[PDB]
Amino acid sequence: SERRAVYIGALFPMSGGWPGGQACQPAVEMALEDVNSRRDILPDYELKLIHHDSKCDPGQATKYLYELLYNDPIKIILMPGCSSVSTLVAEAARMWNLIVLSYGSSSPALSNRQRFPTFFRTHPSATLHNPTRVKLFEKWGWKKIATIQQTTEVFTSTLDDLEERVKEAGIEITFRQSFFSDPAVPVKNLKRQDARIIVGLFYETEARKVFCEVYKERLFGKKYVWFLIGWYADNWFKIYDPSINCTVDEMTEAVEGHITTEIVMLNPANTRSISNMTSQEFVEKLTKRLKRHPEETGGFQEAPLAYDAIWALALALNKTSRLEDFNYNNQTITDQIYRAMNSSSFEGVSGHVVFDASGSRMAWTLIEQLQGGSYKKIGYYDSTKDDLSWSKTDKWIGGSPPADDYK
């Protein structure tokens, strides 16, 4: 007769490096309203949220993790956003027999099961860009690839995965270059070694520095193809930076024809998911809940992953259901949830939701190409099913893609 309250311990980055909590806290709040109103999901239970602002800071998050664990009520799951907060909470979690579900962590290191035994994420690993990269090399028949990176853990781990994935396809990494903050030397070294197909892994500020150096060394044109990350701001190369020698037109020349990969966070199809909402309905409903405009709201693109994380949890809790008897000293309930979370298969607002053996989300990637100082959607790739959605919109100098070597 009485619905028992079951609690989620969440952490939302309202500020810091990735202030994703701005759109992810309301998206979670919407998902809890939708799950609790559905009598076919958890009829005997009411899913409740207890949350804190991590400020995208592990030190700050350490204070709140204590607050979540050392105060009543007992929480059945932990929900962090930032990769640094997730590395802290997902490693600690085993001591309290807690499942950890992240809605925003892209760090490849979080795919380690020995270290993060109860970890799941509706956000894919930064390594999800690699199967799409290998497939694009296979499509355009390239077996020799160059790689330039900014010295960060995420980019190092992404390249380490790229290595083992190219070997599987009969492709080899010719030259590997790196920089901490200044990229003149690896760019100079790329012209030196006559590198043609180049995968560049760096943040937006460093991308600008890379591309100004790319200009000077004339590392752009018919001979050159750049593989970059698709989540920079629109017209990132057009953005004014005092540390930049180059001009907007100069940068526009250097960037032309480069390929980007990005995770699909919102289903491009007009279909209805488990919530019975469409992609556009979710976006409309979420905009109404926001104090500021979507463009001024951190983590607006990631918001569907936060929404679907609640559904993944609700569906897992539904597959199990003795939820009130959960204790930090006992594994029994945890183990059943893990099994239910492992076997997740449903349609969310972000698309089909499935986790690999590491607890990492499997999703579509959107392939784009910079055609005339603007990105054009050249395709989509599904890693699990080896399905490449190809649109005849890719454009190259002369009429076709260049080769990896001398020819």
Added chain:
Amino acid sequence: SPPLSIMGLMPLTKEVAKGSIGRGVLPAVELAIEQIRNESLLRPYFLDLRLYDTECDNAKGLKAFYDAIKYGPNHLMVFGGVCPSVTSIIAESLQGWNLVQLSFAATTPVLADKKKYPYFFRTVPSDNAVNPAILKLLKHYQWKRVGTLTQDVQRFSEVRNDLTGVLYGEDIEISDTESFSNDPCTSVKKLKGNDVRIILGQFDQNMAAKVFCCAYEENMYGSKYQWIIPGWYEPSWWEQSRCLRKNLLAAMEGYIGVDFEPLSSKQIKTISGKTPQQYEREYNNKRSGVGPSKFHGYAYDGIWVIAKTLQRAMETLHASIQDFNYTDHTLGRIILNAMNETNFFGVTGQVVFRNGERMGTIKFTQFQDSREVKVGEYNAVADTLEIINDTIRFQGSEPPKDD
């Protein structure tokens, strides 16, 4: 007699390898506590050190810290943190509970970042503290050109990175910078090829034997060469594939080892009224069957830093403790400012901090036939070097030339 509770954090279990550090330092901590109590230095109060086992594990260490806050007394500060990743986790979070931390064994350079670890202090010099000492050694012998040999592991690359800033604006050139992961031979041949004579090595005990074997094969030993490497390796580390033991020892001859000084060599009375030598005898008696630890003097001086900090804090409150919960930002700031005033002569030498970092003593050793022999010491406070007159030796008529 009200308590002044201190949160002791360290590995203590026999099942954990670094449990030997935590156990090896406890007789030293027991001796400092015992004295401070007898003398009633903290009258009316008494020092209440509570021990919690981190087990040298991130998850267990965090729960040990959390459990101490929940079930333990209202601690005024943190004493300890031994393992680098555990200490980093606790040290970053400190301000959340207004807890000042003093470590005696965590030497990771990372902890010097006061933007990330503002409430963290340490009585032990960090791994980077050898770099100003090496600079003085290079200046002393007129070595203006050096080569570097580093292992591609964070512990060593942190040290090499700091060297760049220490040698900048100084009359010293790094002619060749070489890195290795598993085999040093390629890098050792590149060093030989570039005619490098003075080598600053940063690598582990296992790689050192490989380095010296490559040095024997490349003839990068004798009168024309000086290897300056870590001084923290275990004794007889070389004894423990292509080279013969005699060939390894020939190439090892004359290497300079650099590390922090475990205890002061000065036969002067410290804050406790005992000389470092007297303290060492008292420690050796108290330890019994427990294996000694090189961090014992730092743990001993650490207890004195706490007692002296609490004294200064008590004075500051009297110039205007029980009510302190991890809520009192003011008391945390009082304790913070009091620890920054630390200036006394302890068993490890003069105990002074420079932005939470210890300004201490760096030991120089030289491999002479069968073992490492102390050849000198660097005083970081004075920025001075003292070479022991008739100990340090060279195979030639003069010390080697840098080119």
